[PDB]
Amino acid sequence: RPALYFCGSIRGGREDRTLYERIVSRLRRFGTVLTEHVGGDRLIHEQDLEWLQQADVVVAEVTQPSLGVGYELGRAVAFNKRILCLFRPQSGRVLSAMIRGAADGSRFQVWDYEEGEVEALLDRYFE
Amino acid sequence: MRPALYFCGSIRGGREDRTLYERIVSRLRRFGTVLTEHVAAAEGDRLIHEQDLEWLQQADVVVAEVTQPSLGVGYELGRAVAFNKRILCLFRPQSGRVLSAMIRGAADGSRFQVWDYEEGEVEALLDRYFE
Ligand SMILES: O=P(O)(O)OC[C@H]1C[NH2+]C[C@@H]1O
Ligand SMILES: O=P(O)(O)OC[C@H]1C[NH2+]C[C@@H]1O
């Protein structure tokens, strides 16, 4: 059972907070989830990085633009983590080229999806 | 040999601050070679990622305007930290936003600096850091 780290916008905005709760709930079926979503900012940075380094898979919902989500993904790539990013084209946004373009299709995957189907998608990824 | 400076700022996260980014890039060009995806208005995704990452890896200093939330800007900063780069981040409290804890909290006051500023003062701030 993998250790899972979940990334999603907070100070970038909480528009997708309910969807993040669904994602985290489904991820908890497959492994232990660490996430901020359940001094000062230095402590948050250190704690989030600690949990990210411990994870077997980093899962990020990348629809809402966020510096912190991007930063976590950049650190995760440099740590050579297995990464799953989830993006909703129905938002009308174009996903950052730095995230879409970082994908290699194996270790770093980016999946476009419709909101209602996120649980099934996670089921498929996590077998 | 001119110092190599990489400039980060939101694009697909939103172009609200694009005119300000042109001012920053123009000032940075006084101090060294500027590498950036940003193009002055008067002038696939894997290709963009690889090109921007190569420029970042080749830079001495990474300068980011971090007021507009952006996945790409954050990703570049994360890669830059792991690449052992010197980093300067610029944030405007007049936006009313609370800057991401991952950026504010990554600061160490020397090789990763985060400065709050007012828009009309950005050239003077850059002159201070680079002189
Ligand atoms: O506050 P931000 O939106 O910039 O970043 C939030 C992400 C970074 N750390 C926790 C969460 O995944
Ligand atoms: O499109 P985004 O906002 O996600 O990211 C833009 C930054 C990432 N690469 C160029 C620029 O600095």
Curated annotation (Swiss-Prot), chain B:
<feature type="binding site">
    <location>
        <position position="11"/>
    </location>
    <ligand>
        <name>5-hydroxymethyl-dUMP</name>
    </ligand>
</feature>
<dbReference type="GO" id="GO:0000255">
    <property type="term" value="P:allantoin metabolic process"/>
</dbReference>
<feature type="binding site">
    <location>
        <position position="72"/>
    </location>
    <ligand>
        <name>5-hydroxymethyl-dUMP</name>
    </ligand>
</feature>
<feature type="modified residue" description="Phosphoserine">
    <location>
        <position position="95"/>
    </location>
</feature>
<keyword id="KW-0546">Nucleotide metabolism</keyword>
<feature type="binding site">
    <location>
        <position position="70"/>
    </location>
    <ligand>
        <name>5-hydroxymethyl-dUMP</name>
    </ligand>
</feature>
<feature type="modified residue" description="Phosphoserine">
    <location>
        <position position="70"/>
    </location>
</feature>
<dbReference type="GO" id="GO:0030855">
    <property type="term" value="P:epithelial cell differentiation"/>
</dbReference>
<feature type="binding site">
    <location>
        <position position="13"/>
    </location>
    <ligand>
        <name>5-hydroxymethyl-dUMP</name>
    </ligand>
</feature>
<keyword id="KW-0597">Phosphoprotein</keyword>
<dbReference type="GO" id="GO:0006195">
    <property type="term" value="P:purine nucleotide catabolic process"/>
</dbReference>
<keyword id="KW-0326">Glycosidase</keyword>
<dbReference type="GO" id="GO:0043174">
    <property type="term" value="P:nucleoside salvage"/>
</dbReference>
<dbReference type="GO" id="GO:0042802">
    <property type="term" value="F:identical protein binding"/>
</dbReference>
<feature type="binding site">
    <location>
        <position position="12"/>
    </location>
    <ligand>
        <name>5-hydroxymethyl-dUMP</name>
    </ligand>
</feature>
<keyword id="KW-0007">Acetylation</keyword>
<keyword id="KW-0539">Nucleus</keyword>
<dbReference type="GO" id="GO:0005829">
    <property type="term" value="C:cytosol"/>
</dbReference>
<keyword id="KW-0378">Hydrolase</keyword>
<protein>
    <recommendedName>
        <fullName>5-hydroxymethyl-dUMP N-hydrolase</fullName>
        <ecNumber>3.2.2.-</ecNumber>
    </recommendedName>
</protein>
<dbReference type="GO" id="GO:0070062">
    <property type="term" value="C:extracellular exosome"/>
</dbReference>
<feature type="modified residue" description="Phosphoserine">
    <location>
        <position position="100"/>
    </location>
</feature>
<feature type="modified residue" description="Phosphoserine">
    <location>
        <position position="110"/>
    </location>
</feature>
<feature type="binding site" description="in other chain">
    <location>
        <position position="100"/>
    </location>
    <ligand>
        <name>5-hydroxymethyl-dUMP</name>
    </ligand>
</feature>
<dbReference type="GO" id="GO:0009159">
    <property type="term" value="P:deoxyribonucleoside monophosphate catabolic process"/>
</dbReference>
<comment type="subunit">
    <text>Monomer and homodimer.</text>
</comment>
<comment type="similarity">
    <text>Belongs to the 2'-deoxynucleoside 5'-phosphate N-hydrolase 1 family.</text>
</comment>
<dbReference type="GO" id="GO:0030307">
    <property type="term" value="P:positive regulation of cell growth"/>
</dbReference>
<dbReference type="GO" id="GO:0070694">
    <property type="term" value="F:5-hydroxymethyl-dUMP N-hydrolase activity"/>
</dbReference>
<feature type="binding site">
    <location>
        <position position="76"/>
    </location>
    <ligand>
        <name>5-hydroxymethyl-dUMP</name>
    </ligand>
</feature>
<feature type="binding site">
    <location>
        <position position="9"/>
    </location>
    <ligand>
        <name>5-hydroxymethyl-dUMP</name>
    </ligand>
</feature>
<dbReference type="GO" id="GO:0042803">
    <property type="term" value="F:protein homodimerization activity"/>
</dbReference>
<feature type="modified residue" description="Phosphoserine">
    <location>
        <position position="10"/>
    </location>
</feature>
<comment type="function">
    <text>Part of a nucleotide salvage pathway that eliminates epigenetically modified 5-hydroxymethyl-dCMP (hmdCMP) in a two-step process entailing deamination to cytotoxic 5-hydroxymethyl-dUMP (hmdUMP), followed by its hydrolysis into 5-hydroxymethyluracil (hmU) and 2-deoxy-D-ribose 5-phosphate (deoxyribosephosphate). Catalyzes the second step in that pathway, the hydrolysis of the N-glycosidic bond in hmdUMP, degrading this cytotoxic nucleotide to avoid its genomic integration.</text>
</comment>
<dbReference type="GO" id="GO:0005737">
    <property type="term" value="C:cytoplasm"/>
</dbReference>
<dbReference type="GO" id="GO:0046055">
    <property type="term" value="P:dGMP catabolic process"/>
</dbReference>
<keyword id="KW-0963">Cytoplasm</keyword>
<dbReference type="GO" id="GO:0005634">
    <property type="term" value="C:nucleus"/>
</dbReference>
